Amino acid sequence: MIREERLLKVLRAPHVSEKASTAMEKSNTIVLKVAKDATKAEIKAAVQKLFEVEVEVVNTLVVKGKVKRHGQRIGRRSDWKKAYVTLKEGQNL
Amino acid sequence: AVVKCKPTSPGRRHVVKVVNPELHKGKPFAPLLEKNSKSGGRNNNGRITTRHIGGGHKQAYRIVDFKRNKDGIPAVVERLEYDPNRSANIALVLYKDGERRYILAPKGLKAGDQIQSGVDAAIKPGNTLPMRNIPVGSTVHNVEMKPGKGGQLARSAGTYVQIVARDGAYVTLRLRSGEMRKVEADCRATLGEVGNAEHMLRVLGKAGAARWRGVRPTVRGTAMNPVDHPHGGGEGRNFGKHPVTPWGVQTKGKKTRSNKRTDKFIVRRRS
Amino acid sequence: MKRTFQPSVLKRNRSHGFRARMATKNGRQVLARRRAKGRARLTVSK
RNA sequence: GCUCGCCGGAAGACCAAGGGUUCCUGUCCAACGUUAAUCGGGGCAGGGUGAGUCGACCCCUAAGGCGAGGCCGAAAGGCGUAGUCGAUGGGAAACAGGUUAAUAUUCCUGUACUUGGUGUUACUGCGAAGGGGGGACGGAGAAGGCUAUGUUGGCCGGGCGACGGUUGUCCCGGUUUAAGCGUGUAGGCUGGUUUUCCAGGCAAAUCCGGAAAAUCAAGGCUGAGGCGUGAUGACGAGGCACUACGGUGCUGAAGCAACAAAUGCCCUGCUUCCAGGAAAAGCCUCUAAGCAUCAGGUAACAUCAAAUCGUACCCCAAACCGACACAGGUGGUCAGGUAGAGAAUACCAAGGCGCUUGAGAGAACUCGGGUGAAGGAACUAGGCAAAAUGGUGCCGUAACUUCGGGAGAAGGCACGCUGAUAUGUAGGUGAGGUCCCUCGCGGAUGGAGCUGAAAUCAGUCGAAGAUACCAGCUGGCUGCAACUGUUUAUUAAAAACACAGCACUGUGCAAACACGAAAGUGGACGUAUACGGUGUGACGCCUGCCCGGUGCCGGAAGGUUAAUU
RNA sequence: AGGACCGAACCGACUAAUGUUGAAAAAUUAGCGGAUGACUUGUGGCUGGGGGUGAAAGGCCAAUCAAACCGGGAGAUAGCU
Numbered sequence A: 001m002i003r004e005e006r007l008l009k010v011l012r013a014p015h016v017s018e019k020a021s022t023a024m025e026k027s028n029t030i031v032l033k034v035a036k037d038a039t040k041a042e043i044k045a046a047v048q049k050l051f052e053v054e055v056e057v058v059n060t061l062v063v064k065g066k067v068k069r070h071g072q073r074i075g076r077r078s079d080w081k082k083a084y085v086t087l088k089e090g091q092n093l
Numbered sequence B: 001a002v003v004k005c006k007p008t009s010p011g012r013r014h015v016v017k018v019v020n021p022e023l024h025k026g027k028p029f030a031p032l033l034e035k036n037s038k039s040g041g042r043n044n045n046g047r048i049t050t051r052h053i054g055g056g057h058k059q060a061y062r063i064v065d066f067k068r069n070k071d072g073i074p075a076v077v078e079r080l081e082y083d084p085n086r087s088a089n090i091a092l093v094l095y096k097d098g099e100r101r102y103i104l105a106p107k108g109l110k111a112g113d114q115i116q117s118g119v120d121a122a123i124k125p126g127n128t129l130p131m132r133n134i135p136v137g138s139t140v141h142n143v144e145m146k147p148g149k150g151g152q153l154a155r156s157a158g159t160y161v162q163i164v165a166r167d168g169a170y171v172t173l174r175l176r177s178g179e180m181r182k183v184e185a186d187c188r189a190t191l192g193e194v195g196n197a198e199h200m201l202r203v204l205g206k207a208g209a210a211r212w213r214g215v216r217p218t219v220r221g222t223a224m225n226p227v228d229h230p231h232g233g234g235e236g237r238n239f240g241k242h243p244v245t246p247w248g249v250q251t252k253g254k255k256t257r258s259n260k261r262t263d264k265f266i267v268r269r270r271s
Numbered sequence C: 001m002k003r004t005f006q007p008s009v010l011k012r013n014r015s016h017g018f019r020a021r022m023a024t025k026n027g028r029q030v031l032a033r034r035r036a037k038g039r040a041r042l043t044v045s046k
Numbered sequence D: 001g002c003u004c005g006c007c008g009g010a011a012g013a014c015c016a017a018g019g020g021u022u023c024c025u026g027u028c029c030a031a032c033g034u035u036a037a038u039c040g041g042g043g044c045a046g047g048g049u050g051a052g053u054c055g056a057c058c059c060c061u062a063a064g065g066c067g068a069g070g071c072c073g074a075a076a077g078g079c080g081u082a083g084u085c086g087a088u089g090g091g092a093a094a095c096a097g098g099u100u101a102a103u104a105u106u107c108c109u110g111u112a113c114u115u116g117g118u119g120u121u122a123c124u125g126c127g128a129a130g131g132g133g134g135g136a137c138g139g140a141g142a143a144g145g146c147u148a149u150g151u152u153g154g155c156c157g158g159g160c161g162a163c164g165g166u167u168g169u170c171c172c173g174g175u176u177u178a179a180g181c182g183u184g185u186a187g188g189c190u191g192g193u194u195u196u197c198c199a200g201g202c203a204a205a206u207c208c209g210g211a212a213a214a215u216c217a218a219g220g221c222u223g224a225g226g227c228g229u230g231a232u233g234a235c236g237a238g239g240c241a242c243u244a245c246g247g248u249g250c251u252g253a254a255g256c257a258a259c260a261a262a263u264g265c266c267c268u269g270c271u272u273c274c275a276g277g278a279a280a281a282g283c284c285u286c287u288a289a290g291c292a293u294c295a296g297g298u299a300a301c302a303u304c305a306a307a308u309c310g311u312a313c314c315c316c317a318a319a320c321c322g323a324c325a326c327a328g329g330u331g332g333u334c335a336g337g338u339a340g341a342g343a344a345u346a347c348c349a350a351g352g353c354g355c356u357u358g359a360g361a362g363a364a365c366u367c368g369g370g371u372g373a374a375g376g377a378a379c380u381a382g383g384c385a386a387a388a389u390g391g392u393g394c395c396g397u398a399a400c401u402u403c404g405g406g407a408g409a410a411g412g413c414a415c416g417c418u419g420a421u422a423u424g425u426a427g428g429u430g431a432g433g434u435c436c437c438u439c440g441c442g443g444a445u446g447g448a449g450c451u452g453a454a455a456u457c458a459g460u461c462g463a464a465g466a467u468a469c470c471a472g473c474u475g476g477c478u479g480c481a482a483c484u485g486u487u488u489a490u491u492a493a494a495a496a497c498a499c500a501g502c503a504c505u506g507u508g509c510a511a512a513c514a515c516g517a518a519a520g521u522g523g524a525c526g527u528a529u530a531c532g533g534u535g536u537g538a539c540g541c542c543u544g545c546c547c548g549g550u551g552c553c554g555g556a557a558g559g560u561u562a563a564u565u
Numbered sequence E: 001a002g003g004a005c006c007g008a009a010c011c012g013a014c015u016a017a018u019g020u021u022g023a024a025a026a027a028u029u030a031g032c033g034g035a036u037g038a039c040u041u042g043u044g045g046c047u048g049g050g051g052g053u054g055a056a057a058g059g060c061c062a063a064u065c066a067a068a069c070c071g072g073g074a075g076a077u078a079g080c081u
Ligand SMILES: [Mg+2]
Pocket: A060, A061, D051
């Protein structure tokens, strides 16, 4: 069992893009930004307990931050984790 | 035997090889093998401490029994084998209890012969006895220096040692070098000469043959610069020096033995 | 032609990294010198 | 968009290393781009990397590193035992099709596989830090059986031609399908089986090793490919309908055979040679202590789990190493057609490019080429450079020789195309059919079809038939070095270095010798047929005299002579 | 069979021309040598400065070598410019 506050912390935000939309309307997959150290099991438990849906598999990838210029000053955005959460073809969050 | 190659190429013109049809043609006995990687003449500091060493063919070590202390159990010679680690041949023998061992092959030892070690073994080649039980005048090899330590003298191909006298607790040997030495009468020896006595008739024939054996080229001191060798330097070919080693020690006739610990055992130097 | 710098991250780390420095008192002195100077990058690791 | 040109064993495609957002889309042209720029690897914004099976991680070790105690060292530290790390090596498992602007063996569809944990059921001796087997190993060569792949034919769809001809022996295109599962074939290796006993495997062992009988004489191991299935599926030339000119939806014919054939597979095979060719774990197996109708083991079924990190893009390059968008450097994989011996070379396919300044003109001179009257080395330090030779088959080939060579010596002849021999031969492959049977991935016969040199004879065109590309100049005398190699990275490749061979000399093993204040280590897990040093330098004939000087070796009667007393 | 022969990849570097503020701080073009071996190459490791390594040229040790580079003694000393 994974604790309630761990579940309430692992999820960060839904990811909005054309690929995310296409996944939602075609393969019943939602795309989320999750905690950088969240495991697949933690993501599955969290989405099941916080969205009231059934999940069969989670796919995760780490996105690397973009090096940027802000007035000839070297910056870098933070790496984050993105999760591809597949729902059980009847859930429709 | 000893066969000359035919001069089908300059690198073959002068090759003379020693070929033994009796040597086993298959793989060696796996239980008696170990790894032994090469050093390149380098020590644990990583420095070349012996020059002219490197490369060569990969070799595996054959655990040869130099002690011959399985007393009273006869053994039969299974086959003769090639040992890359020495100049002599090794015979794989089998004991009556089912144990297999590698031994140095004496002259005349063919497959199927019986060998036995112990105080009561017969006086025939391949048998290991204490030298107090070996008669004087006998020709032995694989001679021990300290009882139970293992044979150390006369282990190269064609070599042997003669027992010239026995006075009390010591026997007097004549080593291959011509040196007369005393050793304790309780040390063991194997009767007969070491086999492969034609090993010295081989001719490598080319530089690659020596490179195969892990030997690297020798640069003459006189071909160097003075910063490199005591013999270096010159305009043209100049020597004008007394020959020395790369470290300045005279190298033609100057003796280097200094062991007062073992001086007592040397009856007469090799001359 | 073949220049002198042939990059290799493994060799770079094994010969100039933080742990290679810390393995010896001379390397630790190197680290102390760089910290005293205030270097923003102590080693090749970062 | 249509033409033209270039590469095509690359200038195509995919990786590793390295780089790190350069990837895709929208937008902008200040600076950067050796010019302009609407364009960009530039600026700005947004998007994009999906794994139980790929890789890392992980288990296991090499070289080597670190190293509890330990040994050693003024200190710092050095070495090293037990250990513990360390791949460039060993260790379980996934394929085909589809899809995005950008990912895919990761997503979707279909069909699979591996390991482990639980839970039942049945049966049962389980157990290791120990034993044994295995893993597990070189070079070269040769052949057979295959496949990738290609060609042709058959089949299907389409065509009937901008200029003479083209309903045919004509033209164009397609003719594809995996892992897995079942079978067990060409080949390779091996005698099995049952007893009894034993100084061996640190103890034990039913395991391994050894010994003695009996018995059977065929049993086992391994193994590419094919065949069946996977697959009534997918894909598929096209056709039909459209946004909207990018591409969307539906349907979908044939989908066979023969021949040729790898450097890939059988093959970690086989033969042979000497220079004699990793380790450890996973794996199989044996028991010890121990547990003992519990555990634990085996099998069947069900269920659960397989985490974490990488995944974009470049990758012989404009993204890596060279300060540059630099004629340089950079490991592996793939390997189409025609001709050819070929991965050379020429022209092409797939695919990718025209090298980020152009437009004119047609002076000297410079660079890179083509041709050249007569002569032909007269040039020059020197035939430097250029010119020339150049293939295959056959004929023929000197001195000298270490009998191998010299030798591709030198020199010469033939060479295209057509026809016949023979409507395609010798040879290779080999269907149907027939027969046999220890009946099938079988044997015998049989020759259909396919493929196919080389030669002779006759004819024939051109100035020329090895027509292009490609592709030895040859001979004579002589110095030096025997030879193959190595060398002054970046003015010297040689006659210098090395070398096999020779000789002298040291070294008796705790070796001499070398690196180390030392402990240690190398020599060497070697033992005088070995190891070190020095000189000479294949081979043939040889290697003469001098020990006064210097050095070394031996001697020790005498002279001289230190610390010490 | 072979440190055998001819010859691509690959390794090298004998000649000539170009270039010499280069396309390049050592290259290009045409030829050239080896090309189963004393061969070549990837990855990792070891040897450290009076030291290493060197088939030996005083060669090489990060475009630096008859004694590397960096920091320090250090503002060495300079009857010389
Ligand atoms: Mg992942």
